[PDB]
Each structure stands twice: as structure tokens, then as C-alpha cells.
Design a protein around this motif. Structure first.
Motif, PDB file in Angstrom:
ATOM      1  N   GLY A  27     -25.270   6.409  30.728  1.00 16.76           N
ATOM      2  CA  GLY A  27     -26.392   5.908  31.472  1.00 16.76           C
ATOM      3  C   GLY A  27     -26.814   4.522  31.090  1.00 16.76           C
ATOM      4  N   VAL A  28     -25.993   3.805  30.340  1.00 16.97           N
ATOM      5  CA  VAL A  28     -26.332   2.474  29.857  1.00 16.97           C
ATOM      6  C   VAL A  28     -25.101   1.599  30.009  1.00 16.97           C
ATOM      7  CG1 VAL A  28     -26.716   1.233  27.701  1.00 16.97           C
ATOM      8  CG2 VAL A  28     -28.290   2.940  28.373  1.00 16.97           C
ATOM      9  N   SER A  29     -25.300   0.382  30.512  1.00 14.00           N
ATOM     10  CA  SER A  29     -24.207  -0.544  30.732  1.00 14.00           C
ATOM     11  C   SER A  29     -23.547  -0.940  29.427  1.00 14.00           C
ATOM     12  CB  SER A  29     -24.710  -1.793  31.420  1.00 14.00           C
ATOM     13  OG  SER A  29     -23.647  -2.703  31.535  1.00 14.00           O
ATOM     14  N   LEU A  30     -22.342  -1.475  29.526  1.00 16.89           N
ATOM     15  CA  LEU A  30     -21.654  -1.847  28.303  1.00 16.89           C
ATOM     16  C   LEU A  30     -22.164  -3.175  27.793  1.00 16.89           C
ATOM     17  CD1 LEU A  30     -19.705  -0.284  26.767  1.00 16.89           C
ATOM     18  CD2 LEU A  30     -17.914  -1.687  27.564  1.00 16.89           C
ATOM     19  N   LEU A  31     -22.294  -4.146  28.693  1.00 17.85           N
ATOM     20  CA  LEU A  31     -22.753  -5.478  28.326  1.00 17.85           C
ATOM     21  C   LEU A  31     -24.189  -5.494  27.854  1.00 17.85           C
ATOM     22  CD1 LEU A  31     -20.140  -6.596  29.616  1.00 17.85           C
ATOM     23  CD2 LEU A  31     -21.580  -8.304  30.621  1.00 17.85           C
ATOM     24  N   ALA A  32     -25.003  -4.542  28.283  1.00 13.02           N
ATOM     25  CA  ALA A  32     -26.352  -4.461  27.755  1.00 13.02           C
ATOM     26  C   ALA A  32     -26.379  -4.038  26.296  1.00 13.02           C
ATOM     27  CB  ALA A  32     -27.183  -3.496  28.582  1.00 13.02           C
ATOM     28  N   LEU A  33     -25.301  -3.454  25.792  1.00 10.30           N
ATOM     29  CA  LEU A  33     -25.195  -3.158  24.376  1.00 10.30           C
ATOM     30  C   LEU A  33     -24.527  -4.280  23.606  1.00 10.30           C
ATOM     31  CD1 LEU A  33     -24.213   0.555  24.449  1.00 10.30           C
ATOM     32  CD2 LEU A  33     -26.430  -0.490  24.419  1.00 10.30           C
ATOM     33  N   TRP A  34     -23.536  -4.927  24.206  1.00 11.27           N
ATOM     34  CA  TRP A  34     -22.851  -6.014  23.527  1.00 11.27           C
ATOM     35  C   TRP A  34     -23.733  -7.241  23.429  1.00 11.27           C
ATOM     36  CZ3 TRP A  34     -19.833 -10.575  24.375  1.00 11.27           C
ATOM     37  CH2 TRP A  34     -18.833 -10.758  23.427  1.00 11.27           C
ATOM     38  N   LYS A  35     -24.399  -7.606  24.515  1.00 19.81           N
ATOM     39  CA  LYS A  35     -25.443  -8.613  24.442  1.00 19.81           C
ATOM     40  C   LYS A  35     -26.742  -8.057  23.910  1.00 19.81           C
ATOM     41  CE  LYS A  35     -23.966 -11.915  27.905  1.00 19.81           C
ATOM     42  NZ  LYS A  35     -23.005 -12.254  26.835  1.00 19.81           N
ATOM     43  N   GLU A  36     -26.789  -6.756  23.618  1.00 18.26           N
ATOM     44  CA  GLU A  36     -27.889  -6.091  22.928  1.00 18.26           C
ATOM     45  C   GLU A  36     -29.201  -6.236  23.690  1.00 18.26           C
ATOM     46  OE1 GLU A  36     -27.873  -8.067  19.219  1.00 18.26           O
ATOM     47  OE2 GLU A  36     -25.749  -7.669  18.843  1.00 18.26           O
ATOM     48  N   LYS A  37     -29.225  -5.653  24.882  1.00 17.79           N
ATOM     49  CA  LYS A  37     -30.446  -5.570  25.658  1.00 17.79           C
ATOM     50  C   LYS A  37     -30.981  -4.155  25.760  1.00 17.79           C
ATOM     51  CE  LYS A  37     -29.488  -9.625  28.473  1.00 17.79           C
ATOM     52  NZ  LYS A  37     -30.826 -10.116  28.897  1.00 17.79           N
ATOM     53  N   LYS A  38     -30.157  -3.158  25.477  1.00 16.27           N
ATOM     54  CA  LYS A  38     -30.598  -1.781  25.369  1.00 16.27           C
ATOM     55  C   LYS A  38     -29.985  -1.208  24.102  1.00 16.27           C
ATOM     56  CE  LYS A  38     -30.653  -2.014  30.252  1.00 16.27           C
ATOM     57  NZ  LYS A  38     -31.669  -1.259  31.023  1.00 16.27           N
ATOM     58  N   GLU A  39     -30.322   0.033  23.785  1.00 15.75           N
ATOM     59  CA  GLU A  39     -29.575   0.770  22.780  1.00 15.75           C
ATOM     60  C   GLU A  39     -29.491   2.216  23.225  1.00 15.75           C
ATOM     61  OE1 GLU A  39     -30.998   0.757  18.771  1.00 15.75           O
ATOM     62  OE2 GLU A  39     -29.056   1.344  17.959  1.00 15.75           O
ATOM     63  N   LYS A  40     -28.388   2.857  22.843  1.00 14.54           N
ATOM     64  CA  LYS A  40     -27.874   4.097  23.395  1.00 14.54           C
ATOM     65  C   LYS A  40     -28.918   5.200  23.336  1.00 14.54           C
ATOM     66  CE  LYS A  40     -23.715   6.862  22.922  1.00 14.54           C
ATOM     67  NZ  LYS A  40     -22.529   7.096  22.058  1.00 14.54           N
ATOM     68  N   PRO A  41     -29.221   5.859  24.456  1.00 11.42           N
ATOM     69  CA  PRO A  41     -30.385   6.751  24.517  1.00 11.42           C
ATOM     70  C   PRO A  41     -30.112   8.085  23.841  1.00 11.42           C
ATOM     71  CG  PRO A  41     -29.323   6.664  26.642  1.00 11.42           C
ATOM     72  CD  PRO A  41     -28.592   5.686  25.769  1.00 11.42           C
ATOM     73  N   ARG A  42     -30.985   8.439  22.910  1.00 11.63           N
ATOM     74  CA  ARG A  42     -30.903   9.696  22.190  1.00 11.63           C
ATOM     75  C   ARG A  42     -32.273   9.963  21.592  1.00 11.63           C
ATOM     76  NH1 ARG A  42     -25.829  10.405  20.121  1.00 11.63           N
ATOM     77  NH2 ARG A  42     -26.043   8.241  19.386  1.00 11.63           N
ATOM     78  N   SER A  43     -32.460  11.188  21.123  1.00 10.68           N
ATOM     79  CA  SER A  43     -33.729  11.600  20.548  1.00 10.68           C
ATOM     80  C   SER A  43     -33.583  11.853  19.054  1.00 10.68           C
ATOM     81  CB  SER A  43     -34.247  12.852  21.254  1.00 10.68           C
ATOM     82  OG  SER A  43     -34.095  12.744  22.659  1.00 10.68           O
TER      83      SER A  43
END
Lengths: 144, 185, 48, 39, 260
Positions: free
Chosen positions: A128-144
Motif C-alpha cells: 500500500g505504499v509506493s517504492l519511491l516514497a520510501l527511497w526518497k523517504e516520504k512515507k514509511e512502511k505501515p505497521r502497528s
RNA sequence: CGAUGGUAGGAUAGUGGCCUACCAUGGUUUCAACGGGUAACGGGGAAUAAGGGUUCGAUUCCGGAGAGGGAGCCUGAGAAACGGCUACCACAUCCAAGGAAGGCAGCAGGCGCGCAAAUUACCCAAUCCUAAUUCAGGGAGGUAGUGACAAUAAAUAACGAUACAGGGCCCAUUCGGGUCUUGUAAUUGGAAUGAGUACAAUGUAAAUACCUUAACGAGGAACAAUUGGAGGGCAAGUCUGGUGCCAGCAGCCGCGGUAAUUCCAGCUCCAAUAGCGUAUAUUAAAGUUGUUGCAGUUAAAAAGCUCGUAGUUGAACUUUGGGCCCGGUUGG
């Protein structure tokens, strides 16, 4: 005389030879027989979701030589399996597993004399999260 | 359901993207006239290249052919009425050598600077946008008006703008409310 | 990392000017002045 | 023929759509329900 | 379907009514009556799209319920009653009398007439037959039957009908050199005179008609409505009088007339 | 076990192998019948386009079909109707266990599937249809909420001063005598304005918003544009930093074996400005489907050899010339 008929009442030979040897154009034969369903792993779609079996490491043998990181996956609509590609975590630090992923294709055709070997797919997003949003670090992988 | 609402697209990009002898003549028009992007210059080549196509085949059919005479003398009549064709060039072959700045010199951004109201071509597009100029009685604020010929002579300032009329803006009023009351203290 | 939700607007380098004014700037920097390297042409160069 | 859907459909989901029934439908409304609501 | 249809959608409405294609979704559908569907005009397209008296549908019903509007000396309140060719629409609280007749570009024209021309009506002759108990009758184009005519009437002639008692005064035959209106097709609304008429057995017969400016054309037999002898009609014609003007001729005739 | 025709009945609103009796032996086919596939409802039309064409049309209009799957009929002018009934088949709901009820491919909304698609809102004011009728009814239809599906218009800065530079035309004596053009000077000044907020009025069935307008609203350094690239194709770098932190490496030729004229980052430039960034189909490019218009020996490609079906294609010839005269619009 060109080896084709010219006279006026000749329209039936002319139109029945043309669709006769129109079956050597390589991607008109793919469209009428409809081999996109019967053989392609996607069935005729842009993207497809699968679930990742395990990390794989693949290498490129002749003139080139380095460490190409790919991933197994199993498609939900189909059950068959393919090997995708993940782009340039060349640091060797993003293994992830039993996850939901979204594939796509390459704009495909290539050169594997350096043996950048026989995969056909890639990865555009994961869980549910783009790849480039993690590489350019705009999101981080959703978990609880 | 209901009836559907027509629309159209109004420009078109070119076939070869990066070739240099094109890229400069587009640039020297955008600095000469002050246009925002090159979509504004494609907008004037589209509209031209359908005029040119429309006359390109009335020339094929004969003279004294009643479709040439009805659709010709209307296309000619519309180009003069906005002022692009010269008044001595009222012949159908003369539109086939029309150019793209012969429409660019009729916008309101260009016809207000030539008529002595703004000190530069960038003082036009900011004078128009802020509701200062008013042909006839109507405040327009579009830098691409394409003024008709017999109304070149009506452009002036507005009967509401502080330049050609009433009360100053909310700087000068604010400055007068910053000093005149502060003269005592 | 993420956006900040509080952006309500009711009641290192200096900037570049954005829009039609940027087209004005480019008109000067290649069509009101010059840059050569001995007649031969390497404009927007590497500093040497 | 193309009953092969009804093969692959009605023999992918039959038990994965069975693990979540009675926890949802032990609350049928004449005797067997009590929904607890706080305010 | 299963029965009759009862709605008319907006783009399928007949073109010469000139309903604008954005106001609604359906059009008025004309009732079953004297004139055919795509050859007529309801009383709501008259009273709010031509005379501009009413501004709604709710205003038209308020006019019709006050028993003002007649057709042919008879009161109608059907809000889509089908008025067609040659009908007489007599309002009362203005003392105006209208007659439905064709324009030149193909439309139904507003036409005011006197208080004496509004006492009669023409009508052509669609069939003539021998009815029950041996009496004969005659059927007009709007569907009136009239028993006991003269024997010299034949089909495709034209009768004159008195709207008071529903009776016949006189009649006009059908031969070469007569004044003729054209009520259907392409040359629709033009007036001219008969050159001659050739006949095809088991087919559609063709007349040749000359204008007043002497230019000729051809139509089928059934789109031809006799009016009178040459130079003398029986009704009050509109302006232009059925003369086809070329588009070149009517730009500059609008130009030179533009002196206001 | 009606397939093609003849004669007589039955049945229907009515013609007819529509059905039933007796008889005849017919009808379709290489100018492709009959059968198989279709991820096939048909047309008006849609995208691309020198000309010819290639590929689409579930989807606002007209025509057909269907109401979980097949069959049957009632009432009626009109239905083999499913917001009518009755049977079996597949389903599934309540039950005091005796029984009884059911069809969202109408409108809002479901827990299913998949790459993939909005609110259980307000009203009959308009458009039009129905009724015993001006008055009642209408999820048909209208109005808003959610909407970077597509298409049109165009904010994100414009003007001065000195200053220091140069060019610059000229007074040039040489100065500066004018005209300029920039360049920059966290060098300095004052004017303009809507994004936003909000009395009123107007809009509207009532409201919301757009047009109009009191008071408020900027040096703007913060009211701050972004996506993709900088050997070649193809516009743009001789720039410094990794011990190869964070190396195949970018559609295709390729660049890595330290310091790279491409990876990873900083600076400065380029292109589009609301990105056409990536993926999958199709069209042009394609004279690489060739009627217009390709390819014959050595490059893919003329059958071992002659007779001969259908199909295509087939020499020349049969009233020309002469004379008179009227009446068109054009150069005149």
C-alpha cells in the motif's frame, strides 16, 4: 506484368490473397488467435498483485558482472508464479517477505550478451505504499 | 440522460521535441511580447494552420464557382475586420503568406503598450490583470483580447481604477491612515 | 518525512522568480549579452 | 466449456469464507444477542 | 415494447419546432388527432415559443382553462392538441385571428389575417367513396368526412369548407396551370404553377412546377396542394410569397436593407 | 421425427408445411453451401490522417433482447409481463415446529471479486408523462456533496532613484556633452492588487457557490512550483567530494575493476509548467502488407515435367464529312 492480376472483375482474388498472407505480420497473428490469454502470465493487464515467496539473488555472467536483486511472487488471480525486479537498493538492505506487492512490465526488449538475465517484470509499490516514497523517504512502511 | 456538451482542444505540440533552431525563435517571441509558456505560441499556430487549410482548397475549385465566392469573401471579410489582412491585400492568395505575429500584434497586451499607457510590455499584462483598462465601458482583464479595428480608438482607463479615476488603493489610504492621524502623535 | 496537517490560512539560496517573469530572465541571459570561448562555443560552461 | 470458473471459484473460496461466520452471526435477533453499548 | 409509446425525447423531436437542446430532456409529444405526428405543431409550441405569451407549462394551462383559445370555431383545452396545416386559431381577448401556413425556409409561420378570412378553410381531397346505404362522402387531408358532394369532384382536387356549418361552397379542379403550394419535402413552402404531370403506373407520380421567376423543379404528387388559378390565390400569403432566394442574394439584400 | 412442391381440411387477427392426411422427389453447393471460433448486441458515429487506408463502437439518440435458470397461463384494446400468478430446478429468510413468506441488469447502500469506478442527502420550481383531473402523484427528471476522466480562460510580480561597472551611440578636448542597454549595489523610496476573510444585497423551490460591494488583507524571506534529465540518439558540465558509506547502472550501443567528462551526493545549467513521469493496448513513422505502391541470379522467396477445371483476360471492321442559319457569355 507484376505477377498479380490487373483486370477489372478481379476483386475476389485480390482480397483473398491479402488476408491469406497477412499471417506473417507478427503481431496480427497474436491478436486474432488471442494468445494473450492462453499464455501470458498477466492475461492482458497493465498491473497485477501477487504475494512474495522469497528473496532471490541473480547475477549477469558475460562482459558485465554484478549483483542483481530480484524477488519471487505468486499472483492472486492466477496462482502462477514469476520473478520480478526491485530497483537499486544496491546497499543490499531491503529484504521483505510475505507481503503484498504490485508488479508491472519493462518496456520490454533488451540485450543479455552481458546476461542481464531472463526476467520480464518489476515492482511499483508494496503493502500500500509506493517504492519511491520510501527511497526518497516520504512515507514509511505501515505497521502497528 | 440529456444532450451532450461539445468541446474542442485548442493547440498542438510539435513532432520533434529537442531541436535547437526551433527553440530560439519561440524564445524571442516570448521575451518580445511577454508570454507565459510556449503553449501560448502553439495556440496561435493552430488557429493559423486551419485558416491556411481553409483557403488551401477553395483555390483548387474554379473561379466563378459559387462556393468560392460565398465562403471566400467571408473569410477575407473577417480577417480585415479584426485587422490582420492589409486593406490592399483583399485577394485570396494573399492569406496564404500570412504570418504568426500578425495576430500577435493585435492582442490587448500589445495594443495598449503601443498606444501609450504602459512603459513596457510587462507593464501591460499587470495593468490588465488588475482591472485597470476598459474598452468601451467594459473592464476586460484578458491579455489576449484581439481588438477589432474600429475599436482601437476607444481604449482608456477605467472609471473605477485609481489611475484614471476615483479613490486610491489600500496602500495610500493606509499610508494616509498612518501619517495624517500620526501628525498629532 | 510527511506533511504537517496544520496549514490553515483563513482570517540557503534566494528564490527564483516563477512564471512569466522567468521567461524574461532567460531572454537576457542569452540574448542581451554574450559568452564565448575564443569564437568556438561552449556556453554555460565548466569553470576553467 | 467455461464452467472452469465455477470450478476455480467454488472450490478457491469455500473455507477462507468459512473461518469468519459464527463470530459474526451469533447475534441473530430474537434470543441470542446482547450488544453492549456505552456512552 | 408492449403497448404504445408515450414519451418523446428531446433530440428526437421534429427539427422545425426549434426547441433548444439544453432546457430539458423530453419534448411535448403530440396527441392523436387530426394531423400526423411529424407534420403538426402542438398548442404549447405556438403559445410560448412563437407568440411568447406564456413562460411555462403552468402558464399555458392557465390560459387554456379560461376557454379563450379556439380552433376552427371550437374550443380546445388539450395542452398538446395537434394543430396542423391550414388551421385557424382564434383568440378572443385580443381579437386576433391566425392561420397556420408555411414559411419559405421550411417553418410554421406566424400569420395574422382579417376577421372575414377566418370564416372558411381549404382542404384537399384524399379519397372519395360510396358509403353505407348508397350515399357518397369525401375525405379531406385533415380528416373531415362530408357526405353528398357534387359528382364532378375527383381525388387530388381541393374543396372550400365553411367552418360555421361544416359545408362546401365551391371547388377547384386539378390540371395544368394552377396555383399550387408545396407542403412536404425539400422544396417545402415554395409556390408556383403546373407545367405538366407525368404518370408511372404502380409508382409515385411526378409534377413539374414553374416559379414566377421561371425556374423549375419536380416533386411527388402527394406533396402538392392546389390553391387557386394563376395570379389569384384564395388565401392571404406570407411575405416572400414562396420565392426561393439564393444565399448570395440574401446576404446583400440584408446588407442594403440594413439602414434601419 | 417436414426437408422442397401439389390438393383438401384444421388452427389464427390474418397469409403461409404453421400443423394434420393422402400423393410426387425434390431443394443448397468452389461465385465457399453445411460445420467450427468469437474475451461479437447492430447502426448514427470515434481516434489517427498528402492521397488511398488501419483500428474502434459495453456507454446520453433510434432498433432488438432480457429480468436467478427453463416452461405455462390469468385479466385486458394491448403482456406469454416478472416493483402479476402457478409448477419443477438452484438458492436462501422467520418459526411457540403446527406452518408461512421470497427476486436491486430502478435509486441510495452491502461484507464478494479484481489493475480497475461517488451520498443510505433536498425538492417537485423547470422539462415532460399519468389520472374521474388547473389542485394529487412521480429516486423519470432537476439541485447540491464526493470527483487532477477529459476540455476552455491564466496568479506566483511590475515601476523609480542613486550607486558602481562595462558596452553603447555620440560631446569627444581626453573631460562626459547626449542617448541607451544591462550588470549588480541583504543601496533607498513609494504606488497597484486578489488568493483569503466577511455587514449587506442579489441568486435559489429553499439554501451553497459564481457575478457586484462596506470594513480587513503582503517586501512577498514565508502568501516560498513542481516533476524528469545534464557521453550518443536528443536541448543541456573540462565542477568539486566514496577508498570503490549507499558498486550493472538506466528503452537499445554501452559506462564499472580506485581519482568515472553516466552510479551515490553538493553546486550551476536544460526542457516542458500544471509532469505525458512509468505500464499495457492501437494509430502515424511503414513502399516492414504494397489497388495506388514492395521483393526475380548471388541476400528470406519461381513448385521435377508437360496436357488440362472452375476463376481471370482475349485482333480489326459496319454514318463519316460538306453547306446554310438562329440564338448563349466571355476577350472585347
Amino acid at each position: 506484368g507484376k505477377g498479380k492480376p490487373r483486370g477489372l472483375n478481379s476483386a475476389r482474388k485480390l482480397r483473398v490473397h491479402r488476408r491469406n498472407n497477412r499471417w506473417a505480420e507478427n503481431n496480427y497473428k497474436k491478436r486474432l488467435l488471442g494468445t494473450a490469454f492462453k499464455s501470458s502470465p498477466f492475461g492482458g493487464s497493465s498491473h497485477a498483485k501477487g504475494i512474495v515467496l522469497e528473496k532471490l539473488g541473480i547475477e549477469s555472467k558475460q562482459p558485465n558482472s554484478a549483483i542483481r536483486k530480484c524477488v519471487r511472487v505468486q499472483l492472486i488471480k492466477n496462482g502462477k508464479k514469476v520473478t520480478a525486479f526491485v530497483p537499486n537498493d544496491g546497499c543490499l538492505n531491503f529484504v521483505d517477505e510475505n507481503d503484498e506487492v504490485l508488479l508491472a512490465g519493462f518496456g520490454r526488449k533488451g540485450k543479455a550478451k552481458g546476461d542481464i538475465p531472463g526476467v520480464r517484470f518489476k515492482v511499483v509499490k508494496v503493502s500500500g505504499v509506493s517504492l519511491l516514497a520510501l527511497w526518497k523517504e516520504k512515507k514509511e512502511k505501515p505497521r502497528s | 440522460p440529456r444532450a451532450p456538451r461539445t468541446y474542442s482542444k485548442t493547440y498542438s505540440t510539435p513532432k520533434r521535441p529537442y531541436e535547437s533552431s526551433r527553440l530560439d525563435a519561440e524564445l524571442k517571441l516570448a521575451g518580445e511580447f511577454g508570454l507565459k509558456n510556449k503553449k501560448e505560441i502553439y495556440r496561435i499556430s493552430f488557429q493559423l494552420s486551419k485558416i491556411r487549410r481553409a483557403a488551401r482548397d477553395l483555390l483548387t475549385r474554379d473561379e466563378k464557382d459559387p462556393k468560392r465566392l460565398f465562403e471566400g469573401n467571408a473569410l477575407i471579410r473577417r480577417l480585415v475586420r479584426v485587422g490582420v489582412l492589409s486593406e490592399d491585400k483583399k485577394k485570396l492568395d494573399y492569406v496564404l503568406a500570412l504570418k504568426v505575429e500578425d495576430f500577435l500584434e493585435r492582442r490587448l497586451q500589445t495594443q495598449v503598450y503601443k498606444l501609450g499607457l504602459a512603459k513596457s510590455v510587462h507593464h501591460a499584462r499587470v495593468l490588465i490583470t488588475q482591472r485597470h483598462i476598459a474598452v468601451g465601458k467594459q473592464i476586460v482583464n484578458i491579455p489576449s483580447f484581439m481588438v477589432r479595428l474600429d475599436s482601437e480608438k476607444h481604449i482608456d482607463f477605467a472609471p473605477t481604477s485609481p489611475f484614471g479615476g476615483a479613490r486610491p488603493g489600500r496602500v495610500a489610504r493606509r499610508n494616509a491612515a498612518r501619517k495624517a492621524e500620526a501628525s498629532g502623535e | 518525512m510527511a506533511k504537517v496537517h496544520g496549514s490553515l490560512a483563513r482570517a540557503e539560496k534566494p528564490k527564483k522568480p516563477k512564471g512569466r517573469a522567468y521567461k524574461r530572465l532567460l531572454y537576457t541571459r542569452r540574448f542581451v549579452n554574450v559568452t564565448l570561448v575564443n569564437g568556438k562555443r561552449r556556453m554555460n560552461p565548466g569553470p576553467s | 466449456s467455461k464452467l472452469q470458473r465455477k470450478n476455480k471459484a467454488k472450490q478457491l473460496r469455500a473455507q477462507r469464507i468459512l473461518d469468519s461466520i459464527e463470530n459474526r452471526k451469533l447475534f441473530e435477533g430474537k434470543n441470542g444477542a446482547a450488544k453492549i453499548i456505552t456512552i | 415494447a408492449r403497448g404504445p409509446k408515450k414519451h418523446l425525447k428531446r433530440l428526437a423531436a421534429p427539427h422545425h419546432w426549434l426547441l433548444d437542446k439544453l432546457s430539458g430532456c423530453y419534448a411535448p409529444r403530440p396527441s392523436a388527432g387530426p394531423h400526423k405526428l411529424r407534420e403538426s405543431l402542438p398548442l404549447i409550441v405556438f403559445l410560448r415559443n412563437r407568440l411568447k405569451y406564456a413562460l411555462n407549462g403552468r402558464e399555458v394551462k392557465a390560459i387554456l382553462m379560461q376557454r379563450h383559445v379556439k380552433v376552427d370555431g371550437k374550443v380546445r383545452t388539450d395542452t398538446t392538441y395537434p394543430a396542423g396545416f391550414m388551421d385557424v386559431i382564434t383568440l378572443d381577448a385580443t381579437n386576433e385571428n391566425f392561420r397556420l401556413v408555411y414559411d419559405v425556409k421550411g417553418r410554421f409561420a406566424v400569420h395574422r389575417i382579417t376577421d372575414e378570412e377566418a370564416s372558411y378553410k381549404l382542404g384537399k381531397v384524399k379519397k372519395v367513396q360510396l358509403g353505407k346505404k348508397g350515399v357518397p362522402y369525401v375525405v379531406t387531408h385533415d380528416g373531415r368526412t362530408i357526405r353528398y358532394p357534387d359528382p364532378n369532384i375527383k381525388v387530388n382536387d381541393t374543396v372550400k369548407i365553411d367552418l360555421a356549418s361544416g359545408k362546401i361552397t365551391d371547388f377547384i379542379k386539378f390540371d395544368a396551370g394552377k396555383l399550387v403550394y408545396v407542403t412536404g419535402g425539400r422544396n417545402l413552402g415554395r409556390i408556383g404553377t403546373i407545367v405538366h404531370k407525368e404518370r408511372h403506373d404502380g409508382g409515385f407520380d411526378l409534377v413539374h412546377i414553374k416559379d414566377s421567376l421561371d425556374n423549375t423543379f419536380v416533386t411527388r404528387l402527394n406533396n402538392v396542394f392546389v390553391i387557386g388559378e394563376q395570379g389569384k390565390p384564395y388565401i392571404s400569403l406570407p411575405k416572400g410569397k414562396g420565392i426561393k432566394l439564393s444565399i448570395a442574394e440574401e446576404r446583400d439584400r440584408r446588407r442594403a436593407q440594413q439602414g434601419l
